Amino acid sequence: ATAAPQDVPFEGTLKIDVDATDLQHRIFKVKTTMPATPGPMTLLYPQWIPGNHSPTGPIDKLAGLVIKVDGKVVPWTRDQFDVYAFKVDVPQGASELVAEFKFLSPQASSQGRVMMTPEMLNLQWNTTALYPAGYFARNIKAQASVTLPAGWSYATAMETERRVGDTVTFKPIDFDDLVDSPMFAGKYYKRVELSAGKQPVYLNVFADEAKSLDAKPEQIKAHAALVQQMDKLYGARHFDHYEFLLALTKKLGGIGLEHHRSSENSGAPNYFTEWDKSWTGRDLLAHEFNHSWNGKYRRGADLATPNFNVPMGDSLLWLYEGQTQFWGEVMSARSGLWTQEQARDMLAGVAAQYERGRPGMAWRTVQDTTNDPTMSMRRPKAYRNYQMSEDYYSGGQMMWLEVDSKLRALTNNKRSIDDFGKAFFGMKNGDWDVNPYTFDDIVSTLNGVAAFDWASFLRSRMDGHGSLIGGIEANGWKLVYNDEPNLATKTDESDDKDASLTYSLGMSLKASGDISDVLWDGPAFNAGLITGNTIVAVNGRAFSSDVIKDAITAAKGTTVPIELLVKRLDRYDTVRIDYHGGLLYPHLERIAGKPDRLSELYKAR
Template identity: 30%
Template sequence: MPKRLVFRSATSRPATSGAWLSSRYVRIALGLIVAASVSLADTPAALATPTKKTTRVSARLTAAEVAKPLAQANPETSPSPVPPAIEPQEPATAAPDDATPVIELSVDATTLHRSLLTSEQTIPIKPGRRSLWFANWVPGVAGPTGQIANLARVVFSNEDDEPLRWSRDPTDLNRFWVTVPEGVDRLQVRLTYLANQPTQLSTGVDTFGTRQLLTLNFNTCLVYPDGCDVSQTAIHTRVRVPAGWGVGTAIKPISSDRQTGEIDLGRTSLKRLVDSPLIAGRYYRAVPLDREGFPPTVMHLVGDSHACTTVPQERVDQLTEIMPQAVRLFGSAPFDDYAFLVVCTDRLPRFGLEHGASSLNCVRAMALRDDSLYRHRPAYLLPHELVHAWCGKHRLPEKMSSTNFHEPLGTELLWVYEGLTQYLMQLVAVRSGQVSMGYHREYLAYQVSEQLQRTGREWRPLSDTAVSAPTLRGGPSNWADLRRGQDYYDEGALFWLNVDCLLREKSGGKASMDDFCKQFFAVDTDSPVATSYSLDDLVANLESLADHPWRGMIQRHVYLPQAELALDGVNRSGYELGWVRRKPTFVNNREEVLGSIQAIDSLGIVVSTAGVVERVVPESVADDSGLRERSEVVAVNRRAFSPSVLNQELDAAAKYRDGETIDLIVREGQWYSVHELSYSEGPRHAVLKRHDEGPDLLTEILRSPPSEAVSSEKTASMTAKSKSSRLRSRVTAAVSAQR
């Protein structure tokens, strides 16, 4: 087991000698001595000196006999070999107010390279049967994370380190019931969490560590009392990381000592703490991304090496443009400052997760230095998670708003939460110069082509992919086109492209999604509190901008199954889907990064460079041949498989005569089979082509509208007003707490 934390919460106190003498261990020891004396006095001389084996058995029996009457005499404080079950009942605890003592949390992250995270809490509590929760529904994750499986040690005790009886709730496994004796007003909790082994849904809110870096999500190292409102529950947090490491988080520490690795994050609400992950690393670097007149922005970097976190100035200049374009889109900011937390590593899962004043982004080790890697992921990921600060954090669907981290959330409106964010991400990415206009058109064509393959929309509406999100994220990938995946992202984005085009069309060019964002996500700088919305609110805002049957359109495209993908938005934007033989830059880039051959629009397959069939498109020639996902292609037209051989044979297929096929020899374990693919059109890749009807709305949408740009003076004034208002609120809260 990891060594016990050596730095304790300010409210903890060491046990006195009197308390030690009254501890259960001393009572058991004294009882054993007395019981043994009585037993030996009544034993014949021949049996007075038992063997070692007999001694062990006698000691165990005597301990049980001694413990039994002690437990009967005082069941609340005395030990029991098998703690009796505690009948679940609702605790009589109210949500803590400002006058309630804060929870103290100390976290030791120095052994995360060994996958061990330890923590110690001191929680104000009342005597009686009390329940505490381990987080299971964490904001940003559309489902239960199941991280309770990674708890390796849970100990509840009083301030004298005397263990208290507890049991797990039989129906809510994330809930612990503890019997708190009279006279005890503070509960100590020690946890050991097993890091580096995320569950199906927990990757973005889990904890990871290597010898070079770590990511810490605080939901993995604490419990909280039942009945409390996490936004009103105060917690004082201290963290220890390896000595010499730099630390990045959205919370400004009260103190931080890099030499010892100790950080004091001060007092925050429990909600804000869980919403503020921390990264640390040996090769830490902070890169300011400030632009005058916009919220201060910094990118905290950790990585596998110095090279990973050394960002070229050209990239820094590029990254600096993201925040201004996002603020111009929304017209105001729901945060005082913002932190991009970026982990550059090839040793951890890749993910991104949104937070109120930060985002946690895990990318490839050289993703900020290599143009291909950057275009493939960070160029879109960073704007996506930033947009969530408005769409998902500042305003969120009403069924996704909760006062705790254990009640299930309703995910039906993820086609807004994620779909709209995915669309606005594209606007920010292009307007800020993360990708070029031409590259993004290729990206959009690829996404349209991907969605065309989803035959599952014939039975499953887009809304159901949102409702079923907990079963789709991170789930099995076999035949994903039949089942559908998290289509509320990309098909959702196509829906919002159509909405943007309709707003412009129906309003005569007077309204757009830019106007919708400024209106729907407006920040009240006097009271920047997160608010929820319903479908009715969404429809009402659209109706205020343009006259159109929005509710009927949503019902038709989102809540009903579709025979085929609706391309209304693409067509209204001035484009249509076309096909070319030459690989677009986006496809080349994707193949290079992922190590695969993208032939979904021709043969209907995606094959890794090692020959593994990663995907078979339903109703494609590959599907017709009986090809199976996860099988291995070993030869193409009698030639040993390689990426170049498959591409050459696909090129040659354009000259095939009727009846000629591309023959694949495939291995599944010890078995081989031949699959004849009837195809004669050569390479085929989706592109967007301008049509003759109407203006080029897509280019107009992606271009930053200068007439709607927020001036630096206005933004600076807005930010200053927001800071002043929030400072007054914090001072008022602090004074109330002292009273």
């Protein structure tokens, strides 16, 4: 029941002062100061957070709220039909409103992602802000300040005015850009320049331990090459400068959140020190960097809302996140963050996920999964393979691969998806405002690269139940399965000694034997198994990942079923699974007669 935002001028400055020193309790103390308008005033806590596409504003972690007008406490009343809105009565003749409160950041992952550690912290200004209703967020001039733990370094795209002791005062900035300008801070910090020039790019690394900061020259070069490969694709940079924020940690909550001139990224402490073991997650920075073009600068019209407290429309997330998921993996290969073999096996895993690992495609479309952020909030679901889960990411990626293959086929390889990126995102270098688009704009730009009924193509994939993996075969490769482990799966289930058996027994297991996932309508599903049941023994032998894998191989081509001793709650039973296909892991193999367009796409420019 809050009035709609108005594109009207905001008089004065919204001052946000944050004390970020209580690392033990994980509390941010906040004071927000703003001109006071006589009459009923409504203050808003940001609800829909850009980049999350859902109402992730942690309203229940705002505590200790006290509001004073010219030094006098005024009682506040929350709108019971808009719990993010706080109403007060401002007397006639008033000058200034001051709101003080605390943001109680998660004390465990069960409360949300952790944002403070003994060595670092992550400040997202939307969690420490109240702003007046009735204004477009871009119309509110803001000025932020933060008091850091003693001696800590910090990094943010937002420009600093001065640091006095441990209190950093920033230059004035529009309120929407303030929310889009998060801060990392910590005691173990290394700043590396990735690109010089007029629009420079920097890498800011914070770590649990200083040893994680020892990035080698070739490792830094791959990150510098990422910026170079991005320039080749778009031909423009949508920022006056860019600040990568990377936390190498086991304590901070994982994050991959994009912004115009920065991104919040988390990685394992061995991101650099064990480069060959930590590769599966190294597409993160390429992914978030691409969003500066696709998502931040160019955004769906129904997603580009006027403030943080009106609902966002996620209908075009299969471009926002879908093509960014596509380019994140592509750019990883082009920059050297991934090897070509690593990128190709990653692609095989995605292709298998939609050919055999998503039986829920029979009833649900990828378009409907753009509602998953608001529907699920990434909360646990029983069957990610049947309920589906934000498949506008990887399912959208597969479509954009087919778009690339179709663009090549229509033009005899003279045009590709690279031409769409430059045409759709490469305009107005230096602009980091919002440039909205609609579905028709995507179709029109695609048609400008190569004439075709792109409207039908896009809708048939996003609104259909059929195959999404056509881009693999069109670009000269074929998805196959054999007993050779997938490079991603091998790395992602080793050390833990887990067992991914999605395409054989239709389940995944931990080393303990606990089932961690069950494929809908697969062999494990048809034995009544669910996640949380335990495989106790295989053919009478105590469970291990190697034991169940060897039994799958021993059952290949025979008629002797696999005998599984299963614990369901407090009961034990034995099931016989008649699976005789052996171990099956996805790979890509060349089609000899066809041109290898896939390697062209993944090749450095």
